[PDB]
Amino acid sequence: TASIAQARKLVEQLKMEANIDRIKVSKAAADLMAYCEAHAKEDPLLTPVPASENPFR
Amino acid sequence: LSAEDKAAVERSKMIEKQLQKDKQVYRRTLRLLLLGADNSGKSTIVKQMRGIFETKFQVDKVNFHMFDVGRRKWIQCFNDVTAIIFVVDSSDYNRLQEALNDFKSIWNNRWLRTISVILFLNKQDLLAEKVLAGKSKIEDYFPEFARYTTPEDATPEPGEDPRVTRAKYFIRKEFVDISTASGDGRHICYPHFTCSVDTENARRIFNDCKDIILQMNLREYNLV
Amino acid sequence: CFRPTNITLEERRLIASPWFAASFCVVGLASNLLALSVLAGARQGGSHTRSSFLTFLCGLVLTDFLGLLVTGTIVVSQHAALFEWHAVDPGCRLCRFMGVVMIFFGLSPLLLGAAMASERYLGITRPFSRPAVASQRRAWATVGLVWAAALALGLLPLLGVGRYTVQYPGSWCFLTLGAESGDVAFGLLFSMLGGLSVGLSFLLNTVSVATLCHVYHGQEAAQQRPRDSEVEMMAQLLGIMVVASVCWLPLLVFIAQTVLRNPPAMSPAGQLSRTTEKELLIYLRVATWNQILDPWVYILFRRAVLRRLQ
Amino acid sequence: SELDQLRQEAEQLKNQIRDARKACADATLSQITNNIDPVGRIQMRTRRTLRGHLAKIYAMHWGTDSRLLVSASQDGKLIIWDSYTTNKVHAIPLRSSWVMTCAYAPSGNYVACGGLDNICSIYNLKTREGNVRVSRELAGHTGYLSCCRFLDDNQIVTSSGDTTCALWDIETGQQTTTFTGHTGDVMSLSLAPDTRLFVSGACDASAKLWDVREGMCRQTFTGHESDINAICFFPNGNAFATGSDDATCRLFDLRADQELMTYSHDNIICGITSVSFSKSGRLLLAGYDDFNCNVWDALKADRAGVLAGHDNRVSCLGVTDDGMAVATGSWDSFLKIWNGSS
Amino acid sequence: DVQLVESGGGLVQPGGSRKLSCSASGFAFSSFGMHWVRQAPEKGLEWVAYISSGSGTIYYADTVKGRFTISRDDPKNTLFLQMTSLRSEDTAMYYCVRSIYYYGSSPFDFWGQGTTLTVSDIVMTQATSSVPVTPGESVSISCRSSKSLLHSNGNTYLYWFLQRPGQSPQLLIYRMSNLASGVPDRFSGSGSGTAFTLTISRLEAEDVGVYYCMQHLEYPLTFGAGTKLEL
Ligand SMILES: CCCCC[C@H](O)/C=C/[C@@H]1[C@@H](C/C=C\CCCC(=O)O)[C@H]2CO[C@@H]1C2
């Protein structure tokens, strides 16, 4: 009765995942685009800092 | 550098000195991967010569580091081992096909394309009794064994039944035939006929490793 | 250094041909560059790092290329412009520079050839002794000391032991084949270092071949795998046992016998016999090919290098 | 009868979830980010090369001060580097040399590592004796240890090859919570910036989002075709990227509960070993089997640049907390520190 | 526990020789650099010698260079100081001090109890010799240096110590701002350039003692005169 016990757990888990609130992909996409834009200036790899401010000269 | 930075650098250079001391031990010790099945008897061979059950033994002033494990993910760790010691039990005809499929995975593995395999066909004493009794037929499991003839180049030991030699070399040929299927000389299989109580198993690994190391040098000098 | 020379018009095209020493430079430089281009490509990959063979091999190719380029320009130029050596350079500076560059590049291939033989000997006879990493930073130490030892020998005439004089036909300077105390001390020293370097390469490359054949004749080894890589090594070692000995031994023996001849081969006035002048020129051209064949026997004769070129 | 009926209901539930995800897939991230300008060409130079490891480097982790980092190699040595000076601050000899992961505690007082020995060892860096000593050996996993991450000085999360993740109490040495639900070997995990959630990627080609406090799986993300080897949270915690053996990187959204963008190229046919984001999240850095590290534009799925400085597999990489530099580890036994120049 | 016991001190004739030993227990001795610091009776601290971990670097003060020899025995965890041509100026209590140097380390963290010997350059200034204090009140101690202790790497190599009456010095502040392990948070070190301040909020009975500021920018290491707190 190992398989039948595992089957109940797997079905019960999918119920929890199916009851979550999902936002639109456009709404989710905008948040990812917004976060990158807001922190663009403070990203040294994207915008390299002047050599005076670079610890790895 | 300030007064403390120079002292910190002095600390760093003493660490590098200790890493150099451990480097010399690392290269002089050969790393061997031990693979097989539960009934292969690999645990007996390593014990006689003395998660990861590591055993270190030295033969002729050469240190051997053999990692006995017992896999697509953790096999990447053993990418630079000198050789892979693959052990099977030739007595059990039922699981030989499982070993052949297992051996095919090791030989054709993406991360094991340059690692020679020191194949061991363990329990040859037990294999002889099974063939001598005749209760179990290899042709039941391998139909092609019926049309198999012993090559003239075979060198059976004195006092060995020719029937055993025909069966013993057929098992080896199946493993060797997988080795020659691909590889193009990057790695070489070194089959052997060993038993559990054999006291010469240490040297068989030693001589094969010397050939493995020698073939590595010859590829450097030949600019292969 | 202004030795009197009178080259006959008959010998201006028979023995002392301007093209005789001009085609060797063209072929010699082409072979070294071709064998260095493939060497550079293999070096860029970085897939050969467990042995210091490429470090010695890189030095040998560079030494031979420079030897056929520095001495090549001097000889070719003197055959076309400024033929006279006592007038174009009245001071004995070019000859001393020529004398140093001839000895340095005439002994570095012999010493490197005796060094690569030691690398091949330890990597074949005792594979476990060699570590799995070349440590190329410490590999150049052996190459550096080889050049230091070769250059040290090349400065003895500049320090009062031996001398450099213009030889026949008057386009190159080399150690004088005299009977003086310095000439005997330096003439044999050049031969002993050269003779031992060729002798060491031959002795080691014979034991290395005596080991591969022992493995090749092995019953288990014969059936263990197709032994084709050991065959290619025997051919490569035998090529070294022939090219090095045939090209260099006649020159080294010629110097040893000429200096020890009684009566001396050089007249007190400072003139060699015409027969001996041409023999040294011929033997030098025989030893020239060793710098042209080293890029071939060491590198280009490999089946794994011929395939890459195509 | 009952088993057959139940497994039919699971298929119905899977279709229900797939329809729910398709319902909210009104647009594509590619369409959303079409208007924005590209990042241009990203050029990074090797500022430092950290030498001293004598074997394959398998993992590295920056400390929170953005200056010290710890790297693990299978020569049995944990080394802590001063990245500014390349000085070795510590050299920790490992009892088991088959290490696969290493972590630097956010406090900086501890480091952790573990591999095929199935043990996560905690090392105390600040002792009155002046040496690094083992403070805890966390036993309990029945497979190899694939990843570990500190939450604080007392809590650490480990993922193992026994298909489970665990949350550990370091002081008592017992795992308070066990995270089950993966059907394959879990290869990586990433902690959310608030350390309330973590995602794990396994060899069942699925990524699961776990609640640390509650101890259950909140969401499951599928879409990969092969084993997931690497995973990294987006800097804001609302997304994560994975890397698999199918030569693709995928950007999953937690709230949209589905894939948003795929990062693959036709030339790339090798597996991915490690992934990380830049501080702003605009760059996705991935290490590959073909000896290279490709920097991707996260929003536009364009290959912004290449870090080509290793002669073997790029096994690991990481970006500092301040975003100043990225370190790449490799099987050629070297670590390199990269950043751009004006 | 970490221990540093000195021995070999005692009354010696002028011009004589004496051998001081420092036995270390409870810590990895070979990993730590070692200093000898002496303190003349009713005087401040004076640095004597330094030997690094691995014995590669050795420094001496000018007043003792050529006469004193500092050495260590790592297998025995013993520190030695061979002294010659002893003068009446050498009569002092000699302290054995451990100091380890790596990024973020705290040098001079542990001092020995000291041994008494009796015989028959950046300037650090502590102008305020004594300060009358009352318990529970905030106290500030000032230190000055002839040169700027701020290095180009951002560190300010200024150390603050406390020597309670009858006790060995204890490290309070290392690199001018960081608080040593085991020191209450009420101590705070603030400084800039050449001027430094040690603020002690909510003074207690244990805090009574002499406070020394030391620079570690370069050798020889120099101490301030010291500021004494009395009730
Ligand atoms: C101890 C022997 C050292 C030989 C080193 C070197 O490998 C010589 C190379 C040859 C040199 C021969 C020198 C002088 C002879 C020229 C004879 C002539 O004038 O025709 C130059 C003409 O070929 C090549 C370059």
GROMACS .gro file of C-alpha atoms in nm, chain D:
model
  342
  592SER     CA    1  -0.938   0.078  -0.864
  593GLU     CA    2  -0.869   0.347  -0.605
  594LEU     CA    3  -0.510   0.391  -0.725
  595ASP     CA    4  -0.619   0.418  -1.088
  596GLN     CA    5  -0.887   0.673  -0.998
  597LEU     CA    6  -0.644   0.884  -0.794
  598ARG     CA    7  -0.377   0.898  -1.065
  599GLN     CA    8  -0.644   1.016  -1.309
  600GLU     CA    9  -0.731   1.301  -1.071
  601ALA     CA   10  -0.365   1.407  -1.063
  602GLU     CA   11  -0.369   1.446  -1.442
  603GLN     CA   12  -0.685   1.655  -1.412
  604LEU     CA   13  -0.517   1.875  -1.151
  605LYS     CA   14  -0.209   1.917  -1.371
  606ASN     CA   15  -0.431   2.028  -1.659
  607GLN     CA   16  -0.609   2.268  -1.423
  608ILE     CA   17  -0.277   2.430  -1.327
  609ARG     CA   18  -0.162   2.445  -1.690
  610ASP     CA   19  -0.486   2.615  -1.792
  611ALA     CA   20  -0.451   2.859  -1.501
  612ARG     CA   21  -0.099   2.954  -1.611
  613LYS     CA   22  -0.213   2.989  -1.973
  614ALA     CA   23  -0.499   3.215  -1.861
  615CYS     CA   24  -0.260   3.475  -1.715
  616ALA     CA   25  -0.014   3.447  -2.007
  617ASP     CA   26  -0.167   3.750  -2.177
  618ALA     CA   27   0.167   3.879  -2.309
  619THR     CA   28   0.529   3.769  -2.341
  620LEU     CA   29   0.831   3.919  -2.166
  621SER     CA   30   0.992   3.949  -2.510
  622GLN     CA   31   0.704   4.168  -2.630
  623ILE     CA   32   0.711   4.373  -2.309
  624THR     CA   33   1.086   4.442  -2.328
  625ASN     CA   34   1.104   4.499  -2.704
  626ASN     CA   35   1.096   4.879  -2.669
  627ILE     CA   36   1.380   4.910  -2.416
  628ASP     CA   37   1.730   4.979  -2.546
  629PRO     CA   38   1.989   4.699  -2.539
  630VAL     CA   39   2.268   4.689  -2.283
  631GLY     CA   40   2.526   4.705  -2.562
  632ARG     CA   41   2.848   4.507  -2.549
  633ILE     CA   42   2.963   4.406  -2.200
  634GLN     CA   43   3.343   4.395  -2.182
  635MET     CA   44   3.499   4.261  -1.861
  636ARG     CA   45   3.869   4.209  -1.792
  637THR     CA   46   4.035   3.967  -1.551
  638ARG     CA   47   4.148   4.193  -1.269
  639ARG     CA   48   4.274   3.912  -1.045
  640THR     CA   49   4.368   3.547  -1.086
  641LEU     CA   50   4.362   3.344  -0.766
  642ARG     CA   51   4.612   3.057  -0.792
  643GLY     CA   52   4.686   2.787  -0.539
  644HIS     CA   53   4.413   2.528  -0.581
  645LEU     CA   54   4.562   2.204  -0.714
  646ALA     CA   55   4.240   2.049  -0.845
  647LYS     CA   56   3.904   2.131  -1.002
  648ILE     CA   57   3.729   2.423  -0.837
  649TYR     CA   58   3.368   2.322  -0.774
  650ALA     CA   59   3.219   2.610  -0.575
  651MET     CA   60   3.288   2.961  -0.453
  652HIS     CA   61   3.093   3.206  -0.241
  653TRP     CA   62   3.152   3.572  -0.167
  654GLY     CA   63   3.134   3.705   0.183
  655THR     CA   64   2.891   3.987   0.246
  656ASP     CA   65   3.174   4.243   0.271
  657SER     CA   66   3.232   4.196  -0.105
  658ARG     CA   67   3.604   4.144  -0.045
  659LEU     CA   68   3.659   3.797   0.101
  660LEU     CA   69   3.553   3.484  -0.082
  661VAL     CA   70   3.580   3.114  -0.010
  662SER     CA   71   3.640   2.855  -0.280
  663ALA     CA   72   3.629   2.477  -0.259
  664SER     CA   73   3.837   2.237  -0.466
  665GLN     CA   74   3.866   1.860  -0.473
  666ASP     CA   75   4.227   1.877  -0.360
  667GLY     CA   76   4.067   1.874  -0.014
  668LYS     CA   77   4.132   2.244   0.051
  669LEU     CA   78   3.895   2.525   0.142
  670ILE     CA   79   4.070   2.857   0.077
  671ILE     CA   80   3.950   3.205   0.176
  672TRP     CA   81   4.091   3.477  -0.050
  673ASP     CA   82   4.138   3.849  -0.001
  674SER     CA   83   4.017   3.942  -0.348
  675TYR     CA   84   4.164   4.293  -0.341
  676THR     CA   85   4.519   4.168  -0.279
  677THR     CA   86   4.488   3.800  -0.384
  678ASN     CA   87   4.619   3.717  -0.037
  679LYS     CA   88   4.515   3.384   0.110
  680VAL     CA   89   4.352   3.458   0.444
  681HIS     CA   90   4.292   3.095   0.542
  682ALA     CA   91   4.356   2.746   0.410
  683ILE     CA   92   4.110   2.497   0.558
  684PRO     CA   93   4.202   2.127   0.508
  685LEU     CA   94   3.888   1.920   0.449
  686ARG     CA   95   3.841   1.577   0.604
  687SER     CA   96   3.673   1.463   0.280
  688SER     CA   97   3.827   1.592  -0.042
  689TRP     CA   98   3.517   1.533  -0.257
  690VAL     CA   99   3.363   1.871  -0.178
  691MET     CA  100   3.088   1.999  -0.407
  692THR     CA  101   2.961   2.316  -0.238
  693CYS     CA  102   3.079   2.592  -0.007
  694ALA     CA  103   2.902   2.880   0.164
  695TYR     CA  104   3.014   3.195   0.344
  696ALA     CA  105   2.801   3.296   0.641
  697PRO     CA  106   2.651   3.647   0.614
  698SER     CA  107   2.808   3.731   0.950
  699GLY     CA  108   3.148   3.621   0.821
  700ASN     CA  109   3.225   3.407   1.126
  701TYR     CA  110   3.158   3.069   0.963
  702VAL     CA  111   3.205   2.881   0.638
  703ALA     CA  112   3.037   2.558   0.533
  704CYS     CA  113   3.113   2.286   0.282
  705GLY     CA  114   3.025   1.929   0.194
  706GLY     CA  115   3.021   1.678  -0.088
  707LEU     CA  116   3.012   1.304  -0.156
  708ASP     CA  117   3.068   1.241   0.217
  709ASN     CA  118   2.701   1.339   0.278
  710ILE     CA  119   2.807   1.580   0.555
  711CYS     CA  120   2.778   1.958   0.583
  712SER     CA  121   3.072   2.075   0.794
  713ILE     CA  122   3.061   2.415   0.966
  714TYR     CA  123   3.396   2.585   1.026
  715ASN     CA  124   3.449   2.859   1.283
  716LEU     CA  125   3.671   3.137   1.146
  717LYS     CA  126   3.687   3.351   1.464
  718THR     CA  127   3.845   3.146   1.742
  719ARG     CA  128   4.069   3.256   2.027
  720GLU     CA  129   4.313   2.983   1.919
  721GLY     CA  130   4.381   3.156   1.587
  722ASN     CA  131   4.295   2.859   1.363
  723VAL     CA  132   3.988   2.745   1.172
  724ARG     CA  133   3.821   2.447   1.341
  725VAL     CA  134   3.517   2.234   1.266
  726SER     CA  135   3.228   2.351   1.483
  727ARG     CA  136   2.956   2.117   1.353
  728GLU     CA  137   2.917   1.822   1.119
  729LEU     CA  138   2.557   1.804   0.999
  730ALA     CA  139   2.472   1.439   0.934
  731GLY     CA  140   2.139   1.306   0.814
  732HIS     CA  141   2.135   1.325   0.435
  733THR     CA  142   2.143   0.989   0.259
  734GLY     CA  143   2.294   1.130  -0.061
  735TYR     CA  144   2.576   1.359  -0.162
  736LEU     CA  145   2.557   1.722  -0.053
  737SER     CA  146   2.502   1.942  -0.358
  738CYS     CA  147   2.446   2.291  -0.213
  739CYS     CA  148   2.432   2.475   0.119
  740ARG     CA  149   2.343   2.832   0.218
  741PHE     CA  150   2.349   3.009   0.554
  742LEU     CA  151   2.044   3.199   0.673
  743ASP     CA  152   2.231   3.320   0.983
  744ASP     CA  153   2.495   3.191   1.224
  745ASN     CA  154   2.253   2.928   1.359
  746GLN     CA  155   2.052   2.818   1.053
  747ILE     CA  156   2.167   2.667   0.724
  748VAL     CA  157   1.977   2.508   0.435
  749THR     CA  158   2.126   2.210   0.251
  750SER     CA  159   2.013   2.032  -0.064
  751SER     CA  160   2.125   1.675  -0.126
  752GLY     CA  161   2.127   1.410  -0.393
  753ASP     CA  162   1.877   1.209  -0.190
  754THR     CA  163   1.602   1.425  -0.349
  755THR     CA  164   1.545   1.628  -0.030
  756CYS     CA  165   1.638   1.968   0.110
  757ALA     CA  166   1.681   2.027   0.483
  758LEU     CA  167   1.682   2.321   0.722
  759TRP     CA  168   1.930   2.272   1.006
  760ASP     CA  169   1.968   2.404   1.360
  761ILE     CA  170   2.345   2.438   1.387
  762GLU     CA  171   2.357   2.466   1.767
  763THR     CA  172   2.171   2.138   1.828
  764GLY     CA  173   2.299   1.967   1.512
  765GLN     CA  174   1.950   1.847   1.414
  766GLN     CA  175   1.750   1.928   1.102
  767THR     CA  176   1.436   2.107   1.217
  768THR     CA  177   1.261   2.085   0.879
  769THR     CA  178   1.294   1.841   0.590
  770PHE     CA  179   1.181   1.950   0.243
  771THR     CA  180   1.053   1.658   0.034
  772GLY     CA  181   0.883   1.651  -0.304
  773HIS     CA  182   1.162   1.634  -0.561
  774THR     CA  183   1.174   1.310  -0.758
  775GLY     CA  184   1.537   1.358  -0.863
  776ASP     CA  185   1.870   1.469  -0.721
  777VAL     CA  186   1.845   1.830  -0.605
  778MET     CA  187   2.146   2.006  -0.755
  779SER     CA  188   2.119   2.365  -0.631
  780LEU     CA  189   1.931   2.606  -0.409
  781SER     CA  190   1.909   2.983  -0.376
  782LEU     CA  191   1.789   3.183  -0.077
  783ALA     CA  192   1.553   3.475  -0.117
  784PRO     CA  193   1.694   3.812  -0.007
  785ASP     CA  194   1.460   3.814   0.295
  786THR     CA  195   1.553   3.449   0.368
  787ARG     CA  196   1.187   3.350   0.400
  788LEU     CA  197   1.180   3.140   0.080
  789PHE     CA  198   1.422   2.937  -0.125
  790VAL     CA  199   1.403   2.766  -0.463
  791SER     CA  200   1.572   2.437  -0.547
  792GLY     CA  201   1.644   2.276  -0.883
  793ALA     CA  202   1.668   1.900  -0.924
  794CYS     CA  203   1.744   1.648  -1.197
  795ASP     CA  204   1.371   1.597  -1.260
  796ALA     CA  205   1.394   1.919  -1.464
  797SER     CA  206   1.174   2.099  -1.210
  798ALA     CA  207   1.222   2.391  -0.972
  799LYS     CA  208   1.025   2.403  -0.647
  800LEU     CA  209   0.965   2.707  -0.428
  801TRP     CA  210   0.973   2.622  -0.058
  802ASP     CA  211   0.862   2.821   0.244
  803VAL     CA  212   1.137   2.804   0.506
  804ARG     CA  213   0.916   2.864   0.810
  805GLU     CA  214   0.613   2.663   0.699
  806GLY     CA  215   0.823   2.381   0.554
  807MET     CA  216   0.612   2.291   0.249
  808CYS     CA  217   0.646   2.340  -0.126
  809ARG     CA  218   0.453   2.646  -0.241
  810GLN     CA  219   0.497   2.622  -0.619
  811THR     CA  220   0.654   2.386  -0.874
  812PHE     CA  221   0.808   2.516  -1.197
  813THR     CA  222   0.862   2.290  -1.499
  814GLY     CA  223   0.978   2.352  -1.853
  815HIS     CA  224   1.335   2.227  -1.865
  816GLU     CA  225   1.409   1.916  -2.070
  817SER     CA  226   1.711   1.796  -1.870
  818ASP     CA  227   1.866   1.814  -1.524
  819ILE     CA  228   1.878   2.157  -1.362
  820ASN     CA  229   2.230   2.233  -1.241
  821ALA     CA  230   2.208   2.593  -1.125
  822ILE     CA  231   1.955   2.833  -0.978
  823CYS     CA  232   1.968   3.193  -0.859
  824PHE     CA  233   1.707   3.430  -0.720
  825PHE     CA  234   1.636   3.762  -0.885
  826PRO     CA  235   1.762   4.049  -0.666
  827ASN     CA  236   1.407   4.157  -0.574
  828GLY     CA  237   1.302   3.801  -0.484
  829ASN     CA  238   1.008   3.783  -0.727
  830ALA     CA  239   1.182   3.569  -0.990
  831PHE     CA  240   1.464   3.322  -1.038
  832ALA     CA  241   1.668   3.181  -1.326
  833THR     CA  242   1.775   2.820  -1.378
  834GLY     CA  243   2.037   2.649  -1.589
  835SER     CA  244   2.007   2.298  -1.729
  836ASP     CA  245   2.200   2.053  -1.945
  837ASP     CA  246   1.980   2.142  -2.244
  838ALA     CA  247   2.196   2.453  -2.304
  839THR     CA  248   1.911   2.682  -2.199
  840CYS     CA  249   1.843   2.927  -1.917
  841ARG     CA  250   1.485   3.001  -1.813
  842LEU     CA  251   1.345   3.294  -1.616
  843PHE     CA  252   1.058   3.186  -1.392
  844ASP     CA  253   0.827   3.427  -1.212
  845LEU     CA  254   0.702   3.335  -0.865
  846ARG     CA  255   0.377   3.531  -0.880
  847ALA     CA  256   0.296   3.447  -1.243
  848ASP     CA  257   0.396   3.086  -1.162
  849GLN     CA  258   0.532   3.017  -1.510
  850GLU     CA  259   0.829   3.066  -1.740
  851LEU     CA  260   0.873   3.414  -1.886
  852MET     CA  261   1.183   3.393  -2.107
  853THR     CA  262   1.437   3.143  -2.239
  854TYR     CA  263   1.807   3.221  -2.283
  855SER     CA  264   1.952   2.992  -2.549
  856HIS     CA  265   2.160   3.019  -2.864
  857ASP     CA  266   2.199   2.789  -3.163
  858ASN     CA  267   2.577   2.769  -3.122
  859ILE     CA  268   2.543   2.670  -2.755
  860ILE     CA  269   2.498   2.293  -2.718
  861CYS     CA  270   2.673   2.236  -2.385
  862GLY     CA  271   2.535   2.215  -2.034
  863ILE     CA  272   2.519   2.504  -1.788
  864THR     CA  273   2.690   2.473  -1.450
  865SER     CA  274   2.627   2.801  -1.266
  866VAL     CA  275   2.405   3.108  -1.294
  867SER     CA  276   2.401   3.445  -1.121
  868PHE     CA  277   2.253   3.792  -1.158
  869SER     CA  278   2.413   4.133  -1.144
  870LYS     CA  279   2.316   4.363  -0.860
  871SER     CA  280   2.043   4.536  -1.060
  872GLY     CA  281   1.937   4.205  -1.217
  873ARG     CA  282   1.979   4.336  -1.572
  874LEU     CA  283   2.256   4.085  -1.646
  875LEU     CA  284   2.227   3.707  -1.617
  876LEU     CA  285   2.568   3.540  -1.604
  877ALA     CA  286   2.586   3.168  -1.684
  878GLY     CA  287   2.881   2.930  -1.681
  879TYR     CA  288   2.900   2.665  -1.950
  880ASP     CA  289   3.074   2.338  -2.027
  881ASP     CA  290   3.237   2.488  -2.339
  882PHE     CA  291   3.489   2.670  -2.114
  883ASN     CA  292   3.310   3.006  -2.147
  884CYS     CA  293   3.082   3.227  -1.941
  885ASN     CA  294   2.811   3.409  -2.136
  886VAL     CA  295   2.659   3.727  -1.995
  887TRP     CA  296   2.293   3.754  -2.097
  888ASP     CA  297   2.054   4.046  -2.104
  889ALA     CA  298   1.787   3.920  -1.866
  890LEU     CA  299   1.509   4.136  -2.012
  891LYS     CA  300   1.583   4.090  -2.384
  892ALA     CA  301   1.745   3.741  -2.387
  893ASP     CA  302   2.044   3.873  -2.583
  894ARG     CA  303   2.399   3.752  -2.527
  895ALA     CA  304   2.561   4.074  -2.406
  896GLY     CA  305   2.917   3.944  -2.377
  897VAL     CA  306   3.150   3.652  -2.315
  898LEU     CA  307   3.400   3.590  -2.035
  899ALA     CA  308   3.660   3.364  -2.199
  900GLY     CA  309   3.946   3.313  -1.956
  901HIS     CA  310   3.945   2.945  -1.862
  902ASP     CA  311   4.090   2.633  -2.022
  903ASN     CA  312   3.841   2.391  -1.866
  904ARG     CA  313   3.478   2.382  -1.753
  905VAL     CA  314   3.342   2.690  -1.578
  906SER     CA  315   3.211   2.515  -1.268
  907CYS     CA  316   3.091   2.811  -1.060
  908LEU     CA  317   3.051   3.187  -1.056
  909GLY     CA  318   2.916   3.456  -0.827
  910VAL     CA  319   2.856   3.830  -0.816
  911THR     CA  320   2.944   4.041  -0.512
  912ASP     CA  321   2.671   4.190  -0.295
  913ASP     CA  322   2.773   4.542  -0.395
  914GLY     CA  323   2.779   4.431  -0.760
  915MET     CA  324   3.135   4.547  -0.817
  916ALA     CA  325   3.285   4.225  -0.952
  917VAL     CA  326   3.210   3.867  -1.054
  918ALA     CA  327   3.431   3.568  -0.975
  919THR     CA  328   3.446   3.260  -1.198
  920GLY     CA  329   3.583   2.925  -1.085
  921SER     CA  330   3.691   2.651  -1.321
  922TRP     CA  331   3.817   2.295  -1.337
  923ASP     CA  332   4.156   2.434  -1.444
  924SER     CA  333   4.209   2.521  -1.072
  925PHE     CA  334   4.197   2.901  -1.113
  926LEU     CA  335   3.961   3.172  -0.993
  927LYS     CA  336   3.930   3.498  -1.182
  928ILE     CA  337   3.773   3.829  -1.080
  929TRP     CA  338   3.601   4.026  -1.355
  930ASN     CA  339   3.459   4.374  -1.395
  931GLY     CA  340   3.428   4.636  -1.666
  932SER     CA  341   3.601   4.968  -1.726
  933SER     CA  342   3.469   5.309  -1.826
   0.00000   0.00000   0.00000
